Curated annotation (Swiss-Prot):
Annotated organism of origin: Escherichia coli (strain K12)
Induction pattern: By phosphate deprivation. Positively regulated by PhoB and negatively regulated by PhoR.
Gene3D superfamilies membership: Periplasmic binding protein-like II
Residues noted as binding phosphate in the record, renumbered to the chain: A9, T10, F11, S38, D56, S139, G140, D141
InterPro entries for the chain: ABC_phos-bd_PstS, PBP_domain, Phosphate-bind_PstS
Keyword set includes DNA repair: no
Task performed by this protein: Part of the ABC transporter complex PstSACB involved in phosphate import.
Designated name of the protein: Phosphate-binding protein PstS
Gene (name only): pstS
């Protein structure tokens, strides 16, 4: 009976809890998970009050090196644009990065706006006014979305930038992916970024987006993984998956991180933690896929394995994997 306990990000709480349940059936081992938020994830691990911490945004190599930690990504998420356009069927409209930053900056007011029209040829675009809905409460999705726009729009980067809360130029602010969709459903012409999972079993209509390499892409679990496929990875792990170059890569992808110390004062634990996550990197895939999370491509699973082999050592120099 290994008794593990973690704390952190709420994003993957449902899949970690799924993976956990299934790992006990099989091992009788138990991974408790405190869905407390990314901040407490890092605060608890550094405090050495839990076996592992979990956070959405990756810590810098400097700060990892200072607290004595290592990050490894487990699952991949995705943010889509929920739209309310009269007539338009889900996945029909294709957007741009510049064009999208322009909608969010207020430079674009009508859906039948030329700029959107040249991106959608056989489309009866309406003379409907665009309604922007950004996130009310400070959040990692806003952090992720502004990261996206900051790369693709020269203006947004220079006047509002990126973070969990920014100086939004326009648009209503809704609380949680709840607040956004709800308004979006409630208002014709509305547009609000939302997690792909929430959008999906709540039948939010979404858009395709133009990939960093041109080709328009639909958000699917496959295309979220492709973004990760496109990151260097080797010596960093703190990767941003937005506007990732490659083929069929959903331009707005995110992953979440697990934080464990390198020197294990209780190596009983470290070992037992690495195991749970290895079992998930194998058997746990489908459990995650069916909760709308993309799995981590194998090239990257392979790179964490090596990195484990050379980083988590017990109190006396012996590797734990």
């Amino acid at each position: 009976e290994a008794s593990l306990t973690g704390a952190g990000a709420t994003f993957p709480a449902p899949v970690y809890a799924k993976w956990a349940d299934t790992y006990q059936k099989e091992t009788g081992n138990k991974v408790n998970y405190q869905g407390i938020g990314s901040s407490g994830g890092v605060k608890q691990i550094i405090a050495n009050t839990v076996d592992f911490g979990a956070s959405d945004a990756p810590l810098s190599d400097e700060k990892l090196a200072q607290e004595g930690l290592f990050q490894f990504p487990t699952v991949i998420g995705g943010v889509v644009l929920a739209v309310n356009i009269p007539g338009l069927k889900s996945g029909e409209l294709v957007l741009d990065g510049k064009t999208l930053g322009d909608i969010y900056l207020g430079k674009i007011k009508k859906w039948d706006d030329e700029a959107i029209a040249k991106l959608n040829p056989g489309l009866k675009l309406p003379s409907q006014n665009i309604a922007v809905v950004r996130r009310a409460d400070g959040s990692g999705d806003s952090f992720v979305f502004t990261s996206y726009l900051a790369k693709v729009n020269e203006e947004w980067k220079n006047n509002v930038g990126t973070g969990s809360t920014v100086k939004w130029p326009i648009g209503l602010g809704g609380k949680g992916n709840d607040g956004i969709a709800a308004f979006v459903q409630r208002l014709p012409g509305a547009i609000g970024y939302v997690e792909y999972a929430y959008a999906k079993q709540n039948n939010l209509a979404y858009t395709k987006l133009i990939s960093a390499d041109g080709k328009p892409v639909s958000p699917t679990e496959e295309n979220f993984a492709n973004a990760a496929k496109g990151a260097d990875w080797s010596k960093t792990f703190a990767q941003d998956l937005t506007n990732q170059k490659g083929e069929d890569a959903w331009p707005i992808t995110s992953t979440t991180f697990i934080l464990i110390h390198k020197d294990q004062k209780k190596p009983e634990q470290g070992t037992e933690v690495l195991k749970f996550f290895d079992w998930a990197y194998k058997t746990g895939a489908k459990q995650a896929n069916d909760l709308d999370y993309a799995s981590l491509p194998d090239s990257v699973v392979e790179q964490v394995r090596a990195a484990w082999k050379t980083n988590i050592k017990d109190s006396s120099g012996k590797p734990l994997y």
